[PDB]
Amino acid sequence: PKSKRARVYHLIQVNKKGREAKERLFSNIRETIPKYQHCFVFSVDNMRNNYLKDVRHELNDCRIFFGKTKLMARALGTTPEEEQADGLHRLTRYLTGTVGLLFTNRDPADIESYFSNLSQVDFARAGTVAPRTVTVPTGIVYSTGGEVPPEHDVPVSHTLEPELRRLGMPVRMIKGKVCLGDEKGEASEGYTICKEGEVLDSRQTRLLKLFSICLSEFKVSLLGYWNSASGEVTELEAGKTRPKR
């Protein structure tokens, strides 16, 4: 009855899609199935997935799908009685988590060669181990936190100062300038935001992003592919190492 939280109505131009987006994704995959020769399945497990836009542009030959795992499972067809081609139900067995689809016409070996060759450095994301022990120096703090040498650096903005205190650094303002201990230096030690071999909390990941310190690699792992002409699926070293359902 009463004693309830008041929902805030949003005076904004975008609203929830709901049913129409789900059937649009169903229909768009449905017309994509006959047009291409191979359906590759891939996973980006704990990446930030902002560079998937870049692999969209330079691979204009193929069609790429990345949405709800359950929706792509039925769009391909989990049951062998409801499927649009033979062997699609075995392709749905790889659809477990953050999993996308790749409808391509080119060589299967060319796709694997390119995805192994691509490598980009990205931000850490929560739950990862830390490859480095990084530390902000004792005195004036800067935009990068000491990754670049400070003579080529720029002092960090004063707007960021309440956020750094919220995320856990004891940071104060002297003369309009954001610093850690004293402006000259000393009077404290540096702040360690991560240690080697430590699981990165989301507080630490937000601190590394703010200084633009990157500790993770964005990569795309191909699980397997299905050939339209052949009719069965194959796996390459990624289906063995990951649970399937």
Partner: peptide
């Protein structure tokens, strides 16, 4: 609080209309 709820429900209805969609002063002052 009665007047605020009238204003906020007018704001909801005007927004819902505008988001779904894609003389007496002159006579007196003369």
């Amino acid at each position: 609080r009665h007047a605020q709820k009238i204003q906020m429900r007018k704001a909801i209805k005007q927004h819902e209309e505008r988001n779904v969609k894609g003389t007496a002063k002159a006579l007196s002052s003369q």
